[PDB]
Write a protein that binds this ligand. Structure first.
Ligand SMILES: O=C1CCN(c2ccccc2)N=C1c1ccnn1-c1ccccc1
Ligand SMILES: [Mg+2]
Ligand SMILES: [Zn+2]
Length: 313
């Protein structure tokens, strides 16, 4: 009960900032997650023994892939921590519990392949889940781990509160399907601009949490340039492996996934920042003004990709 997690001074200070990088010491990441749960939710939210067992089973069910790995899980959870900490009073007790867990679990058992590749491969998961294929799998893996003996971190919740938090987690994980982001943001834009956005409306809260999940999921584009640049290598390592596997199916992949077309990456990054990242953080900042640092960092990285094209690096 009186056992607090405490970080070294540099991490204690920098973990509060949106652009925090969790570092290369894998063995410190569970401690970093518990620290964030304790400050974001409370020391009483979870039984420490159960929470630690849950974290280590989640870690075990992330694969050794270049990008969609345990480090991504904890990085996305940290961005959610920074949003929740900068928006103290906007979220319920159940939301703050559910959302850090949703972020830690959101890519469980990822193989480094898109929904598109599973569909073209005719993977068993594409028959089980016709849309948001990997995201339905991630939620399924989350429920599986929660149901392991001694892993039910929600055991003190009532039957109805348990159903609510698992529904927050389900919607939050499904929302990380980038196919669904475009429509979600357009609706939030319309609601904000016509002034009809209402945070007491549950359908509206769901949409705002969805955009928060996109924002946290893409947060590699909101880090300092050296972090963003080096993370991009891991992202494209997966894309190019998917491209190789498309070529093995006798399908020319899109240029983004073709390692023969690396020269086209800088221009592809601009498209992504302009079509996905900047609009995401712009709408998030309109709804949650204290998340402005994410938009600023995103714009800084857009400027860096423009410099790569001009051959200034
Ligand atoms: O940087 C890039 C290149 C373009 N790209 C992308 C992804 C899907 C479809 C089209 C483009 N995504 C990113 C990116 C930045 C942060 N996260 N992600 C991301 C998101 C989902 C899967 C893998 C990576
Ligand atoms: Mg995902
Ligand atoms: Zn993700």
């Amino acid at each position: 009960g009186l056992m607090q997690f405490t970080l070294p001074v540099r991490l204690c200070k920098e973990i509060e900032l949106f652009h925090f990088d969790i570092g290369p010491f894998e063995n410190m990441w569970p401690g970093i997650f518990v620290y964030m749960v304790h400050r974001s939710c409370g020391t009483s939210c979870f039984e420490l023994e159960k929470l630690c067992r849950f974290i280590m089973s989640v870690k075990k069910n992330y694969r050794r892939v270049p990008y969609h790995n345990w480090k991504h899980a904890v990085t996305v959870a940290h961005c959610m921590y920074a949003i929740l900490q900068n928006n103290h009073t906007l979220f319920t007790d159940l939301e703050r519990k559910g959302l850090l867990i949703a972020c830690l679990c959101h890519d469980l058992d990822h193989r480094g392949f898109s929904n598109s590749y599973l569909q073209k491969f005719d993977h068993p998961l594409a028959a089980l889940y016709s849309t948001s294929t990997m995201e339905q799998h991630h939620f399924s893996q989350t429920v599986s781990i929660l149901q392991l003996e001694g892993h039910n971190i929600f055991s003190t919740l009532s039957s109805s509160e348990y159903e609510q938090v698992l529904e927050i987690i389900r919607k939050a994980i499904i929302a990380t399907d980038l196919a669904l982001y475009f429509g979600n943001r357009k609706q939030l834009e319309e609601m904000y601009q016509t002034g009809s956005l209402n945070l007491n409306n549950q359908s509206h809260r769901d949409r705002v949490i969805g955009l928060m999940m996109t924002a946290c999921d893409l947060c590699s584009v909101t880090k300092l340039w050296p972090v963003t640049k080096l993370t991009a290598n891991d992202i494209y390592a997966e894309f190019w492996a998917e491209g190789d596997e498309m070529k093995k199916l006798g399908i020319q992949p899109i240029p983004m996934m073709d390692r023969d077309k690396k020269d086209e990456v800088p221009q592809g990054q601009l498209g992504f920042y302009n079509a996905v990242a900047i609009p995401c953080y712009t709408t998030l900042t309109q709804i949650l003004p204290p998340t402005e640092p994410l938009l600023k960092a995103c714009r800084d990285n857009l400027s860096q990709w423009e410099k790569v094209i001009r051959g200034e690096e």
